[PDB]
């Protein structure tokens with residue numbers, strides 16, 4: 001019927017496929033890679049400081065879509081963006097299927113997912129009571145502030161994602177696997193090792209579907225619902241890439257930290 005008598009008893013309430021031992025090892029590695037690079041781990045809610053409320057209310061630099069930029073808010077956010085980008089690279093480097101790619105492939109994949117991953121890490125720290133996001137576990141920001149400091153409607157999409165993810169009760173492994181599925185994408189141009197990257201994505205997706213089955217979440221249809229959030233995050237990444245091109249047409253390079261320009265000054 002099954003396996004041994006013990007195995008069937010332990011699996012008695014399981015229906016759905018659980019992770020294999022090899023998937024559990026993949027899951028453990030990705031979870032630890034995320035927790036060792038996710039800032040302020042559990043400490044974030046006490047240790048975050050609100051962005052002063054008089055910053056972000058003065059958008060005066062024009063943009064093509066008519067959502068203007070407040071340069072002082074954009075400066076406060078870019079001031080802390082280089083350590084946050086650096087943690088996404090630290091995370092990817094800790095995944096063996098990423099670190100074994102050619103160096104050129106690893107840079108293309110990191111450029112392709114960086115905003116998706118930093119937006120997910122802000123959105124999972126949405127706080128319903130203050131209606132804020134937390135940036136790098138330290139800066140609490142209101143919708144108006146993040147919208148006027150350069151993101152424009154991107155910030156609304158991240159807040160909407162953050163508010164919707166509260167009911168999903170994601171744990172650190174789910175966040176780490178959504179990050180690995182975002183990272184291991186072949187939807188980018190100029191990759192060499194396409195088949196290998198697709199195979200990794202498929203291994204991460206299936207470990208992730210089996211870990212979701214293991215967790216027995218209390219909202220129904222959890223796995224497709226979570227896939228639809230991955231799609232929302234890729235839309236957020238595309239919106240940000242379009243918006244960042246416009247930033248650079250409008251504003252001088254001196255305002256953009258070198259690593260921020262490198263990861264996104266892109267297509």
Ligand SMILES: N[C@@H](Cc1cc(I)c(Oc2ccc(O)c(I)c2)c(I)c1)C(=O)O
Pocket residue numbers: 039074077078080081084087115118119121122134135136137149150151158244
């Ligand atoms: N909160 C994340 C890091 C994180 C840091 C920052 I600054 C963010 O804001 C952005 C992002 C792109 C931009 O062009 C602008 I202007 C502001 C976001 I959204 C996320 C972490 O915990 O790693």
